[PDB]
């Protein structure tokens, strides 16, 4: 996909040459954050499946109509809510991947490309997701650098959905 390492290799390749210092110093900077990022991924790996339900609920408070209105694509039924918690998870799981890779790559190919084309066709609304994501943003309660890297990718996701 698209990691900062990969981005650097593509640049060099298009010129058919080895890495320039600027791109070298650029990559050397990657490894200086890898620890922080990985530490974020470890946090999601554990208390992340839970952050899912937490959001699944909060979103029902902002949008009550989702849990009531006879849903062909709504969480009205108990089986529909089961999917809403799975969807929240996927976003989180994908975001964690970004902390590991150290870039937008995962989000870019797994959930960003072709996002709206799909949603606005199956009747799902971006607002439900955007909201439930902000929840985990504040609530996760991550330290600072591990939180610095974790939050960075959450906002990027919130951006694309807007």
């Amino acid at each position: 996909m698209k990691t900062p390492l990969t981005e650097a290799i593509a640049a060099a390749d298009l010129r058919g040459s080895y890495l320039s210092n600027t791109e070298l110093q650029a990559v050397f900077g990657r490894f200086n954050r890898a620890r922080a990022g990985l530490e974020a991924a470890r946090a999601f790996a554990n208390n992340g499946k839970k952050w899912a339900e937490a959001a699944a609920n909060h979103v029902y408070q902002k949008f009550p109509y989702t849990t009531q209105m006879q849903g062909p694509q709504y969480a009205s039924t108990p089986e529909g809510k089961a999917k809403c918690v799975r969807d929240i998870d996927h976003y989180l799981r994908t975001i964690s991947y970004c902390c590991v890779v150290g870039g937008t790559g995962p989000l870019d190919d797994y959930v960003v490309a072709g996002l709206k084309e799909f949603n606005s066709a199956l009747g799902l609304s971006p607002s439900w997701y955007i909201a439930a994501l902000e929840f985990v943003r504040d609530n996760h309660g991550l330290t600072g650098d591990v939180a610095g890297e974790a939050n960075t990718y959450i906002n990027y996701a919130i951006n694309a959905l807007s």
């Binding site: 390492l5 080895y18 991924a41 790996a45 797994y110």
Partner: protein
């Protein structure tokens, strides 16, 4: 194109699982020896031309017929083409070291190299022996104790060896 981190993520997403603890530890390890890794990458870059030139010279002395009249590599147009190609191998082996994954080399370079060379009357086994020789010089430069902080970048070497061999294997 896929790098070391991207690859592990790739496999985790196929099973739809968060990166297990052990996998975070596997990578933490890679981040640890990163400075050594880049040292290797940088040394190969600097000695690029030197490496390729000698590998050629060693090879001509080996199979001299290949480069004289009638040979698959006669004429400057060809001679320089062969050098260029060896330069290509080294360059992609380097990308492979920096990435810690061998994907770039496979797609961008080794993809259909065996067929190209074949349906072009190039010896193939001679290219393998050229990658082999290039590989010796590469290892000796990258491992030179002089000028670098004394340590053990053993694994890094075993991983360099693997890339070159993977190359030579794909054309022979």
């Amino acid at each position: 194109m896929l790098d070391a981190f991207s690859r592990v993520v790739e496999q985790a997403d196929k099973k739809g699982a968060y990166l297990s603890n052990d996998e975070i530890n596997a990578l933490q390890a890679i981040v640890a020896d990163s400075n050594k890794r880049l040292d290797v990458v940088n040394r190969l870059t600097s000695n690029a031309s030197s490496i390729v030139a000698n590998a050629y010279r060693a090879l001509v002395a080996e199979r001299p017929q290949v480069f004289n009249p009638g040979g698959p590599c006669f004429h400057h147009r060809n001679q320089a083409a062969c050098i260029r190609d060896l330069g290509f191998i080294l360059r992609y082996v380097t990308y492979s070291v920096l990435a810690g994954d061998t994907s770039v080399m496979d797609d961008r370079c080794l993809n259909g190299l065996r067929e190209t060379y074949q349906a072009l009357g190039t010896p193939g086994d001679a290219v393998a022996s050229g990658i082999k020789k290039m590989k010796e010089a590469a290892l000796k430069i990258a491992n030179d104790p002089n000028g670098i902080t004394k340590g053990d970048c053993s694994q890094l070497m075993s991983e360099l060896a693997s890339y070159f061999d993977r190359a030579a294997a794909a054309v022979a």
